[PDB]
Symmetry: C2
Subunit: 206 residues, 2 copies
């Protein structure tokens, strides 16, 4: 309806996520089911593949398994992830990587995706991915995964938070295209710029 302004049927379901996500930022300081796992130690086992070694660059990819351990030493959950180094930004040649992760808790599942700036994370910045719950008590939830690689061991130990909270009637997304759209919508708030304007009005490979 309206060739002029055709938005997909799922648009209201995506839009509903945005006030919930901002409300989570204010409620995540202290009704709904709220899962907060603060100050986790994330033990990562990383398997990196090089396209054209010994240089990190486009075509590199990795898989990883994470165990999430709370300060009391208890495993609260696991994660399986995969990332691909995709391109260098036209503006400053930063390596842009995309990740997809599957989280497993004792009583359910959730997933993330998002962009990482290669330069930023080597400097010790926080990385943040939006979470959509996919099963168990998490299925009706949205949230945020925040990790910082420890300066001691930046590829094996991370400091990590996981925050998820129920939204009324749930996010209602099951189709992988809607889920991906939801993860991009929320990722806009927390993710790096994919390709800033260069100034010369040209997106040249650097």
């Amino acid at each position: 309806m309206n060739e002029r302004f055709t938005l997909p049927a799922h648009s209201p379901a995506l839009a509903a996520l945005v006030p919930e996500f901002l409300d989570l930022a204010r409620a995540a300081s202290g009704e709904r089911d709220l899962a907060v796992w603060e100050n986790l130690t994330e033990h990562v086992s990383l398997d990196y593949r090089f396209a054209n070694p010994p240089v990190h660059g486009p075509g590199d990819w990795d898989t990883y398994d994470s165990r999430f351990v709370d300060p009391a030493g208890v495993e609260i959950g696991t994660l399986q992830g995969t990332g691909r180094i995709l391109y260098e930004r036209s503006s400053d040649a930063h390596l842009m990587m995309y990740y997809r992760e599957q989280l497993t808790f004792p009583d359910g599942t959730a997933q993330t995706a998002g962009w990482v700036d290669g330069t930023a994370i080597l400097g010790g910045a926080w990385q943040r991915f939006p979470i959509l719950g996919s099963g168990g008590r998490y299925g009706s939830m949205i949230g945020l995964r925040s990790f910082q690689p420890t300066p001691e061991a930046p590829h094996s130990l991370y400091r990590t938070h996981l925050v998820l909270r129920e939204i009324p009637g749930g996010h209602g997304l099951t189709d992988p295209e809607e889920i991906d759209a939801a993860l991009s919508l929320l990722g806009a708030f927390v993710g790096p710029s994919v390709n800033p304007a260069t100034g010369n009005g040209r997106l040249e490979p650097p």
Copy 2:
């Protein structure tokens, strides 16, 4: 505190940028556009494409372009112009489609606007509609958001597009000035209209396809 929505270490577990509420404000507005309002339906978009390859003959990552467009209404009046640029960046893991990122600057007699967003190169081929969010940048359009929708014409898919432009004022405006906020806004609205940047492959391995 200056960069974040709620300052202090108690908010390290859920840190959003300070501009998050302005970004959120755009979503209801964007959804409302369907139903000061500038509309241009059934424009003929005359496109002068300048297309480069990196490993001809094959279409792949490193291919890029610049294009100049003229927007001509049905009566034959030039109502504005556009300068665009695009890059083929990678092949999706799932189905190997060529993912491209574009950035465009729109010039009208009475102001300016900008777009950015993803294109599935392997879907423009099928003559599907392409949609980019618009943010006003100056003059009449400075306070507006909108949508650019174009389809290459069958008889001339390299040089003539059928094009719609909708821009509408938000009261007090969108209140984005800095490239970081502009890019995030284009990315937030782009989630509704752009292609999936890398669908889950099923085998849990974003391996190069």
